[PDB]
Amino acid sequence: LVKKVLLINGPNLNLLGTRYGTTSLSDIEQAAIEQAKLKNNDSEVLVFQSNTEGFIIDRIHEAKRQGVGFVVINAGAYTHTSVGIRDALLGTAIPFIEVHITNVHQREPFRHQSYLSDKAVAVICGLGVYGYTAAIEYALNYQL
Template identity: 50%
Template sequence: MKGAGSMILVLHGPNLNLLGTREPEIYGSDTLQDVDNSLNVLAGELGVELDTFQSNHEGELIDRIHAAREQGVRGILINPGGLTHTSVALRDALAGVAIPAVEVHLSNVHARETFRQHSYISPVAVGQICGFGVASYQLALRGLVMHLAR
């Protein structure tokens, strides 16, 4: 399942900088740095490189997606946070660059409030992983690397 040195962009959306302290009963006690550290360990095992980025600003996330095409990024792992349910612009950026993306969420968004059950991102993603806490990111990275290897 080696990714042959593929570059994967990992995008963390709004409020994910608060992981570990924000509603730990929903999102757990791991910090964003913990998430990135565990992803980097797994990336080494899978033979891929990661570029991780967090922003609370929609436009910055869109700019990173646009730049990914020029940087030779082969896949995008994205937790859009609350933008999942509101951002047509983020959806359009992902569709526009045509880089395979996997949507990831720590909680099971389908078992939460009704407004969280709709995603603008899922229709342009190759898959979605949610509900497994920090392990959601690891499962999503494995799935993305497997998709890219096909």
């Protein structure tokens, strides 16, 4: 049963929500950190965001070294474009759930393809920032 979970957010996700509710990246991350703290059995949620593909891959490599046992990832645009992230998650063999805040199926068809869905444990989309909470409950419940 998983104690170490890493939340990753991809490009542009630092900009929520400067433009549709004031919910920021900082919020999501915090709520995730606190989610685990509150199980009080040393679960931990580590957090990372970047706009660089390679850096997200670097972070995933790091995660394995770190004994991270699950990843909740919202790869933002990189979902549609990055085989590299897919190969990283496969490569280090860490199970993961793909999060999208909005319903991608509502948008441009290029967004309906993902390089993560078919290898994710699960894909949550359009559940809002709550979608990160649901993934993290799943994660903290998953057998090593």
